[PDB]
Symmetry: D2
Subunit: 414 residues, 4 copies
């Protein structure tokens, strides 16, 4: 029964973010966990620092691509489990980009590029670290090292959109000293969104009062947890990757369809969450061609969906038996999100979408002036039963040559 | 009881072809049927000839891309329903590429490029034509025009891999004079494969003795028809497009997953058919970026599957209850094609593929020396019951960093 | 093309009861036992000596048909095993007159049907395992088959129909159907002829279909004779009784299949296998009582209702049936209504739509309890949307039927 | 992770029980919740006591039917939400069978019948009660009334197999004084099984938790260092527990068999429910299900009682599973077809390899329980793989869940 604090309300309006995984692992192109899962010799793996040139990393291109896909923030891996830092740690560690041939603070380039495009920069930081022996040998000292690495991020790069922490699940029973860590963040970055990824086995959990967002990794839940009754509201976020891996994986051919990606983005909004779509950069920091294809396709959809994608919120309006349709609410309009439509041919050439296609909703109590598809402005016919709050629209199929996967009709009230 | 003629045997070894739709419709990017389905003014639509530059058509790059994806032939639209010819009709018509600014016989460039890459060139020819008034006003004269247009293709381009006719379904009861049309083809191109697409309502029918291949458009059948029992054997072919349209359609976002494309290719081989994977070129003749992504991903799979994709054939060996696995036979080996595998993590991090995974097959009666995955040469453990012809393998999951969608194990016999 | 009167009458029957009873019934391991279990023929045929029919009461069978809402009964007069349940008058010694029963069972059956206003139909297997003629002299077999049918055509008065089964065993043979059906037409001009095998002869009235045929059935060519259709269901996996077949379908599935038949424009036969001595088993009685509650409720539409070009909205299994005065919405996948405290699933407003109704509606009500439903129409697009309320607590009809009353 | 108490171990060996719903509601045949859900006038509904004759209740027939179906206990509704008691409450209430024309202690008849058949009598008791005003108007006094009603059951009927409490879910936040209620039960009936249908372990004295029918995974047996608790699932034949004449939505007999097998697989007991008629008879429809289930449980007798879940999984895409006794393993195999022949193809004809992972011991022989046919098999002992040719049913039979006994070397 609490409502979101302004910065959280601002976060929910972001809607869609791009997740970016890039580290030393990227050179191998066999997934970001390669060092542990393939049981590599650490010394040999860590030699990858010597060929980390970042020769194709262009933060401007990345920010441009995020803008074009309709993303409003980017979460970049500043340090993954491998423990290599993509920024200047100022003497905290020698395992950082300043000790690689790249010799560029990549996080500085990233934040400048985000600002030029009006995107919020978010920093992913692994809390489970494979590089520093402090992790197992002196946990209290490890917490200090982690906190210092975050402190550098809080003080050297201007205002930060958010932090995305990951790895506390590796030591479920430890005292991670979150009030000190989060408190430090609140001191230097009062407006930052704090996310703690509590991992696959503990979905929806709030690990500290300072947490703003709970995560659902890889897969969508049925409902988003918004925090205990009477406590601070926390937002939710789902994250998906295009194939089975987060870092680039050259021989992972198991990509989701573009259509499924569109349905997952719409679905997140339906259940009241943001969604992160992940891409893994190449070894040298380029967006791979495959990811570019997905971004172009999703980008066509998000441009069409712009009136509702950001401000639209769940509302107690359900769809009729046997359909996957749903409704989103802004302060001026309702929007019918309609799935499973077909292309329209003509009476001679039948594509599937030709016949009258009544789609009903329960929970709309106000007389409607008009309804129209966002993609082409066609006006739909509809009937209402105001007492039972029933709306029925004839959801016409796609014009030949197009197929939006999730089609959106805007409702204009009297 | 008949066996395939040599040319048809050669056809079945092709396995995979690339279908290419390119015409005036391409400039509009709203599907190849746009002229009819969107009720365009014919005069105005046909003005698209004036901006047909083919400025980005490079037959060499196209043939190279076909070779890299593992295709062994290409079917190119020489004339679609719109009735515009991509070749020099030598006085038959003014509605051809020689009267467009391109001024290049595109079919000549195509055939030369195919030959350099050892690909068979196939010519798609629409028999239902929206351009010539002969079609409705004087059908007998239309048949003469169609036959002459095919005759030009038969005499001016060297040996032709095949012809892919489409549109007889528009007049199911007409006499199309197939003996004369196919007799002419047999005269000039005795070795050509003749395919007649009998359309969605008439799957797998033989419209003349000269037909070599029956088609199944868009969708896969349960069984491939090989002709009436004592008659000429005919091969089968399934055709699929990446989204919902054959020509390019910019706002059709409803793409199939790469994984489904891989499964459909494997499936086609399982049931004893070739498969055509379709791309629509841009207005100026380029392979679009999205199609390139699919070709790169499918290309990794077909390179791995090369030992079996071409020579492999269906064999009476079935898989155990509840699996989608199947077997292909070459003269030296059997190959287990195994679906629904997961990635292998480790003891600590579980991804799904870790446990022993017994997959059984019924119909293998010969003792086996060894079994190994094509992708990494790992040796699989197995047991046999020779009397009941049971084989059981432990189908290990993918090494982290990879996912082949359909994984293939080669059997080596004693 | 218009159905002949007898075929129009047939389609109004709607539901029939199929009865399988033969020597196989004594073994209670399915009607194909002789062939599938590779039994010694001589030994199997000895079952004639214990065929007493001690518990066969044709009146109880006719009563069970009436209670289930069936309008005809198809009885196995001779199955593949080749034993005749009637007096063949010298054609064969392998008939009920040579068994201890010593009763013409078909005569008792026809009298019982008549008393209950039901049509008697005779199943006759054309694939026969008894007579050596079948393999050793096919032309003479056809004569024997025809004679056995002739006895049925001439000794019992007017018959409802004949249900032939087995031509599929020899798909390429000449069965001499014009002679066989011509003989039937001579003695029994009004009888329905069904062939369980596509139309194999002009005299066929009804073809059989697979119970899961999705689409409305084939009625023959535009200028040809109209042929009706029929689907069949058995309660478990076997037609004759099978004591250790526990794989019974749900009553709900049986109800759905009966409704589905009407939706695609077919009759439906529900099968029971009698015990060795001719009794209806207790399990079959349970199904009859449950289906019988449904068919009594559905009576306004079950007989006269016909398919009509009105489709249901996306993701629904709902369908419409038409009589001359009314349309009926047949609505599936409803839930029971509890309250605010006790949620059973059927509580919320439940809009179910249909496309193809162009006339203004006065009133719509459920057949089971007369509750009036609210609805809206778009007459131009022919859309109807009803609030299909869920079942009153304590009931669940599986297929619920709403009658439409027009203005 | 501790070992079950003797009484609980004995409970798990019961395997299958019959649930029986019978009360005043039965006379209306529109479900057991009719009084509340149909918003009936309380005074008028409660008049049903005057026609409660029990004229067709025969506890002996009920116990016989339970025995024949292979059930080892019966849970009878002694008082449902309607609040009418099927036993002599000895002055606690006038709304009991002694004030109805029946004038017979039905629970006494029930316990005697169970004993003659070697079945454990269990008493269902609704804790959510619609009759007494105490329930809403004076909850502390209600708890006393409930406890007294249970006390009568604990002192007047000899040793009681168990109690099956239902209704605490109506007031999830209330203090139900379970230490006192269960403490009283422990005093008079130390060996009784206590089940609380929570709609979680609500008190240390609970022996059995109830679970959903469709629970996929092996059940929760209590926190790691604490008392082991058993599990139980329930199924009814249609949508209602009391009789409901116009509820035609019956499950298939096949689904009932699969649910019984499934309960064993997850390590639970299962209750199959029947609702008696107004006058206390088993309806004909219920009899059909019991005859069918009975055929299956008689065949499954070697494993149904003593069989327990074990870490042996089935191959990809099958629903097969394994149960373990001290002498044998049993393969429970689903989705088989009938065997015809080459000419008449019924589906079960081909070799049908079904695999399991987790068996590490060499096997001597495997055979179907229904007909003793010996199955062929191969093993890979290092990877613990077993593959059997699971032959289809002989024509004329179909067991739904077929069971193969494994005999070890
Ligand atoms: C988003 C994912 O979440 C974590 O749990 C990591 O282990 C993965 O590598 C990835 O970063
Ligand atoms: C392969 C497809 O087949 C035909 O039927 C054409 O009408 C389509 O446009 C396309 O070329
Ligand atoms: C109705 C069924 O149909 C036939 O084909 C027979 O072979 C069956 O035994 C049964 O009579
Ligand atoms: C077994 C069922 O369990 C309870 O929750 C009751 O409310 C039902 O009526 C029935 O007794």
């Amino acid at each position: 029964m609490t409502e979101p604090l302004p910065r959280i309300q601002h976060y929910e309006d972001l809607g869609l973010g791009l997740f970016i995984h890039w580290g030393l692992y990227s050179q191998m192109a066999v997934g970001e966990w390669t060092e542990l899962i393939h049981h590599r010799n650490q010394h040999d793996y860590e030699q990858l620092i010597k060929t980390f040139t970042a020769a194709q990393f262009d933060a401007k291109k990345i920010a441009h691509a995020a803008k074009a896909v309709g993303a409003k923030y980017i979460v970049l891996t500043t340090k993954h489990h491998e423990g290599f830092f993509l920024y200047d740690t100022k003497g905290l560690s020698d395992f950082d980009v300043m000790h690689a041939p790249a010799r560029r603070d990549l996080i500085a380039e990233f934040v400048a590029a985000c600002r030029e495009e009006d995107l919020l920069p978010f920093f992913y930081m692994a809390t489970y670290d494979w590089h520093t022996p402090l992790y197992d040998d002196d946990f209290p000292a490890y917490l200090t090292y982690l906190q210092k690495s975050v402190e550098v991020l809080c003080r050297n790069y201007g205002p930060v959109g958010g932090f995305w922490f990951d790895g506390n699940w590796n030591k479920k029973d430890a005292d991670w000293h979150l009030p000190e860590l989060y408190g430090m963040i609140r001191h230097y970055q009062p407006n930052a969104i704090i996310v703690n990824n509590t991992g696959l086995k503990n979905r929806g959990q709030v690990s500290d009062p300072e947490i703003d967002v709970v995560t659902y990794e890889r897969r969508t839940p049925d409902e988003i947890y918004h925090g205990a009754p009477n406590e601070k509201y926390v937002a939710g976020e789902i994250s998906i990757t295009l194939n089975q891996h987060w870092g680039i994986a050259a021989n992972d051919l198991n990509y989701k369809s573009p259509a499924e990606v569109i349905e997952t983005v719409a679905h997140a909004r339906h259940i009241g969450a943001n969604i992160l779509v992940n891409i893994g950069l190449t070894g040298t920091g380029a967006i791979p061609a495959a990811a570019q294809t997905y971004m172009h396709l999703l980008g066509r959809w998000t441009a069409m969906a712009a009136p509702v994608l950001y401000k639209g919120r769940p509302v107690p309006v359900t769809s009729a038996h046997g359909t996957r349709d749903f409704v989103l609410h802004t302060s001026k309009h309702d929007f019918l999100c309609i799935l499973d439509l077909q292309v329209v041919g003509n009476d001679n050439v039948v594509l599937g979408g030709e016949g009258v296609n009544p789609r009903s909703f329960v929970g709309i109590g106000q007389p409607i002036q008009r309804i129209h598809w966002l993609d082409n402005d066609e006006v739909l016919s509809f009937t209402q039963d105001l007492d039972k709050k029933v709306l029925t629209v004839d959801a016409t199929g796609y014009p030949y040559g197009s197929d939006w996967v999730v089609r959106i009709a805007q409702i204009d009230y009297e």
